[PDB]
Design a protein around this ligand. Structure first.
Ligand SMILES: [Ca+2]
Ligand SMILES: [Ca+2]
Ligand SMILES: [Ca+2]
Ligand SMILES: [Mg+2]
Ligand SMILES: [Mg+2]
Ligand SMILES: [Mg+2]
Ligand SMILES: [Mg+2]
Lengths: 727, 727
């Protein structure tokens, strides 16, 4: 009964594509490129080496390229009606059949679930997701006899290897299991095997896995009460806003198996209603992921994340095209496709190409957005505040743990200007798929530096990470949204609280992106209110990007670089300079990508200002030599940090003109600093430009009227904040 | 009798321009932009503040902007026939006339020749060069009475201030004097003042200046027996190849007054034959300067040079347009104009716009080139070796001292790939015109770091700079070309010697850019042959750009960073790691801008390999935290360093594919290491690819036959080198 192909590329799709070839430029260009890639590999032959290497090494790269080429050859066979591509697929599949059944477990031992073709079952699963698509395309070209042998001695044993033989890999809520479930489900759908389809959807019953079983990034295999299978992987790690809890770098990775297996289920098993599952979260999550990119389309490096990953990736070409075709045909997705400059060679890519040709493209709007975390949207979140035409972007992370890849980074932020990183989230310590750096795998310093709180722009207490850097503790906690109000494009405000990172301490951080008279550009206002039951040492880092220009405080320069501390990331920071404040406001300015920036922060006489540089205890040169300024406030119980980050002026080494190189801040002052209310007065240097932000800290209700006095003058407003011009 | 304007913009030119407006896009676009700029400044008014500041500060930037705006207003008045612009010029000139005569010497005391409007006479001279052009454009609009007052009480006193009152600035062979001579000459030409015209052409007679006196950059004010004036500044600091001895960054700066005053002389005094002077060197020098830029048009940072200065600068818009119009109408210059995207608003810019419109543009060929230094071309030189379509670029500097801005780095080199710096020349320590960095002026670390030999990719002996870093010694010496042969695009070789940098030591450095079977790309071969009369410590730095990927040697990582040494630049290097070689070849690889690089060097077992980081003894953060690898060879008399720099493969954080990340070098071996002959065998990993470079070291004659034995085998060739495939 079942047609082949039908999962991704459909029979009707092949006919529609063939009818339009030559009149769909983005598709035609992709077809030419892919045909040339596959033809070159056909010329080189068929290589299925005995597996040996980690990522970047020959056997890994060869088996990886093979799965990409097989899927490409499958669609070429169908679209071009050229059996040279079917013959290549047949010959490669049979060469695999000749070796796979006799392979040992992969000789590399790092993985908690060692693969056969690859060092880990994740990559064997990648292979089967792609190869299942190729098999769907050549199914009718093969004889019944050929299909029987491939299914019996290659595909069914492979599907069992990555599932029932490795339930620790397969049966989780984790990107690994999403790939595993998709691999088993895709091949099950092609073969019409109900057992495998059910195993894909609902996982393995009674897996026998014990308590506290972990993998290699610090994460539990199983979580009490959680289901397994594809549907569990949709329900648990996505919020109702389509935010994937591992963060955008890993959301990017998981989007491929999520949307490909969803597409396959939609086409073969429409009764599953997979695109309606969890209030249509998979389709929504594509928009959400695109919103988590900077002006150049590069995903914000939250949690474990390599900088440079972007919506130009193959996963986002796939996700955009599937979301366009199977969703509500959102014309904003077509502008992303135009930027990508390629489409999938299937029904969905054709739909995108036709939408573009018909003049339907609309610009993808990059907006201020509140995203919830947790399956029910009640476990913190992530906020993005954007000014104007994506002119300045603040990312505030008040999220849940994020599973294994999560960082100890409650209430951290990062700042960008038109695709230039200004205040960074470090990302991972890993050179992804570069064999020369620890086999392309996570490095020691991912744990010892990149995950630690001191590596982030957030509060560190007593040189200890949030939750003492203990995964099992952090996994039980999330920061809490206090309020989000981005309605005023000139004054956008978000506020969140964290009281479990350091038991006995309450952190309440409010961030605002504010455009006001006296300043060339919007600035960031950062209020970090700290309450505690004991005198502590508080560190507040700012990991700036660029060349130091000026300070308004003196600092000493040591004759030798010593580490800042001994543990929890401090062992990776060199102490490059130590400043003492000259007064109530301390300022650091720098130049980055032709623009000046100034950090102004409210300082006390006994504060220390630490210039630091990353790179201590880094024997393999695994860390970047980036700099930071850390405010250290010793022997302090309750305190409120108040900072402004300005962007101003410009420099060019062509014109050699320096323009507006100084700050426009005259003064920032806490006018009220209580548990119930915080008030910050901001004075610009030009003319009578004064503004006041007042925060109500213990009642978020939008209709609650507040009455306070500052210097014998009454201020009245409704809701959790007011920003007023002081005349 | 004399028409006005006539120096730069001519009356015939105004008519020709007016006739073509609307049909010359590059010109029309420039006119629109400049009109908007000037109209905005007219709206803001006329501000001539009491001078106070250094560069980047208000009074400097305001008086600087004024001279640019006055020249722009002059050409707008003429082109648009709109007295709005003439009135602005008149009013600003008279506001200047009201204040200039009563000014004190500029209150800042740094300059050896303090200005009146600016901290230095150089900038007062900039002002007069530009304002003379504006005066030429409004000369007939003003009354005789107005002109008489401006000439008597503004222009003539100004011209004397920057010349006869400051002969130490005016009467040199120096970019300062080129600007000063042009300033006096330009105003002299507008006024028809023969005395000033003669003072511009031939300098001050009997200047009385001290010989051996130094400027504030460490170089001599006046050279014994040397002429002064504009013609001397053409003859002396340019070689017969059009290479300006101060280096490309300063050549760029001087190109404006050279070509502007030459144009004025050509138009007003054609009998001078200024464009024929020194065998037409000024026109040639424009091509030479363009050839001294990387693939993005950025000038190589040789000697004092800020990175990022490029042929998009105003000086190169000017130089290109004048060279096109008054030279042989070289169509290659039109492609540079198209890249610049603007032209001068005058006869020369019209000529360029019309050439572009008529389809005459041809691409500017970026070639391998040998450039001599010294007035007669016999004081060393600079060699640029380029592979393919500007695919890899090696810059080898065997030059003379370079006057005050020259660095102590005989035989240094730098390496670029398609506009990406791979091995750097540091450039200057100065943030040009940024007030926050020492008033935008040369920093202490320009002398203590940037000029020193240890900052360069060349030999350092006993932790001492070339010539002991003494100008009075270095200025008397230059390296000597041995041979240059770039005729074979696959195998380009240059060789030079230096025996005075370290008296008693002979340095003979041969560099080659070689494409051969077994390697993806051309590589650089570096042979640094050293002969001495004593056992020395030799350091050879490689200041690489990028992220360290792998080494084939172990190295220790200290718990504290200590400076590498105490003096001569070593005080600015942190010792980050110390390796000992594992064998005869040591290797370091890195990743920069998506490409891998490997340095392989021939090591002895007692060598030290030092990982260093710039930034010690840098209390103001004036230096970049760039890294290097230094080969240290102690207690050694004669030795020959042999290194290869490979470019291979690629990485993308979008695809996450690492390709060809390992070196293709199997072995490099010194097969013969004598004073008379050097032979280096290169083995690629592909076992059948072996090559041999043989150098004859004591006879450069191209027809001299050589017969030598290596491992019992005779080799015969003619000329100073042979590169042969070993079968
Ligand atoms: Ca992080
Ligand atoms: Ca280049
Ligand atoms: Ca230099
Ligand atoms: Mg998942
Ligand atoms: Mg951005
Ligand atoms: Mg001034
Ligand atoms: Mg000076």
């Amino acid at each position: 009964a079942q047609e082949h192909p039908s999962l991704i590329l459909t029979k009707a799709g092949v006919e529609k594509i063939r009818a339009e070839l030559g009149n769909i430029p983005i598709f035609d260009a992709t077809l030419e490129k892919v045909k040339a890639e596959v033809d070159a590999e056909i010329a080189l032959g068929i290589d299925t080496p005995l597996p040996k290497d980690y990522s970047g090494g020959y056997t890994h790269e060869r088996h990886k390229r093979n799965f990409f080429i097989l899927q490409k050859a499958g669609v070429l066979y169908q679209i071009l009606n050229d059996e040279k591509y079917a013959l290549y697929i047949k010959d490669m599949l049979f060469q695999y059949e000749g070796m796979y059944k006799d392979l040992p477990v992969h000789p590399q031992t790092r993985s908690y679930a060692r693969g056969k073709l690859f060092w880990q079952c994740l990559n064997d699963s990648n292979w089967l997701v792609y190869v299942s698509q190729a098999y769907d395309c050549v199914y009718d070209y093969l004889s019944k006899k050929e299909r029987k042998q491939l299914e019996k001695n290659l595909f069914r044993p492979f599907a069992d290897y990555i599932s029932i033989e490795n339930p620790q890999f397969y049966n989780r809520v984790h990107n690994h299991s999403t790939w595993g479930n998709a691999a088993v489900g895709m091949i099950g759908l092609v073969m019409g095997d109900e057992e495998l389809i059910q195993r894909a959807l609902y996982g393995i019953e009674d897996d026998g896995l014990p308590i506290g079983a972990k993998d290699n990034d610090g994460g539990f295999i199983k979580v009490e009460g959680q289901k397994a299978g594809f549907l569990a992987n949709i329900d648990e790690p996505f919020s109702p806003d389509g935010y994937y809890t591992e963060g955008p770098y890993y959301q990017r990775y998981a989007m491929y198996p999520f949307l490909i297996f969803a597409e396959a289920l939609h086409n073969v098993r429409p009764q599953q209603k997979i695109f309606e599952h969890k209030d249509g979260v998979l389709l929504k999550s594509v928009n959400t992921l695109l919103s988590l990119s900077d002006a150049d389309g590069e995903f914000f490096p939250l949690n474990d994340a390599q900088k440079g990953m972007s919506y130009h990736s193959r996963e986002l070409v796939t996700a955009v095209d599937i979301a366009y075709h199977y969703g509500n045909h959102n014309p904003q997705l077509l502008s992303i496709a135009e930027e990508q400059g390629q489409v999938l060679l299937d029904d969905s890519g054709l739909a995108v190409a036709l939408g573009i040709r018909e003049g339907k493209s609309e610009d993808f709007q990059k907006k201020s957005i509140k995203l919830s975390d947790g399956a029910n949207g009640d476990q913190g979140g992530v906020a993005i505040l954007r000014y104007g035409n994506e002119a300045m972007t603040l990312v505030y992370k008040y999220a849940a743990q994020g599973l294994s890849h999560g960082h100890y980074d409650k209430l951290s932020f990062s700042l960008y200007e038109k695709g230039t990183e200004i205040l960074q989230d470090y990302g991972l310590a890993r050179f992804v798929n570069i064999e020369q750096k620890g086999g392309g795998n996570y490095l020691k310093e991912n744990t010892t530096w990149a995950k630690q709180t001191i590596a982030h722009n957030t509060l560190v207490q007593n040189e200890t990470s949030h939750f003492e850097g203990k995964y099992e503790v952090g996994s039980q906690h999330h920061s809490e949204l206090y309020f989000f109000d981005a309605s005023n494009p000139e004054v956008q405000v978000v506020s969140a609280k964290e009281q479990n990172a350091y038991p006995g301490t309450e952190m309440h951080r409010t961030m605002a992106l504010i455009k006001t008279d006296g300043f060339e550009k919007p600035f960031v206002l950062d209020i970090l209110r700290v309450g505690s039951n004991a005198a502590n040492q508080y560190d507040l880092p700012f990991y700036f990007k660029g060349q130091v220009m000026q300070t308004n405080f003196d600092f000493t320069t040591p004759k030798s670089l010593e580490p800042l501390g001994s543990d929890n990331g401090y062992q990776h920071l060199w102490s490059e300079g130590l400043g003492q404040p000259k007064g109530d406001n301390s300022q650091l300015s720098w130049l980055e990508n032709g623009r000046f920036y100034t950090l102004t922060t409210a300082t006390n006489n006994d504060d220390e200002l630490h210039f630091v540089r990353i790179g201590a205890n880094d024997p393999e040169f695994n860390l970047r030599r980036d700099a930071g300024l850390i405010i250290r406030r010793k022997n302090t119980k309750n305190t409120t940090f108040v900072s402004i980050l300005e962007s101003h002026g410009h420099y060019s080494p062509v014109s050699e003109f320096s323009v507006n190189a100084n700050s426009s801040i005259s003064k920032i002052e806490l006018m009220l600093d209580t548990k119930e209310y915080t008030a910050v007065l901001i004075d610009a240097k030009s003319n009578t430009e004064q503004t006041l932000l007042i925060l109500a800290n213990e009642n978020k209700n939008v209709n609650k009227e507040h009455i306070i006095e500052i210097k014998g003058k009454e201020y009245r407003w409704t809701g959790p904040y007011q920003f007023i011009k002081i005349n």
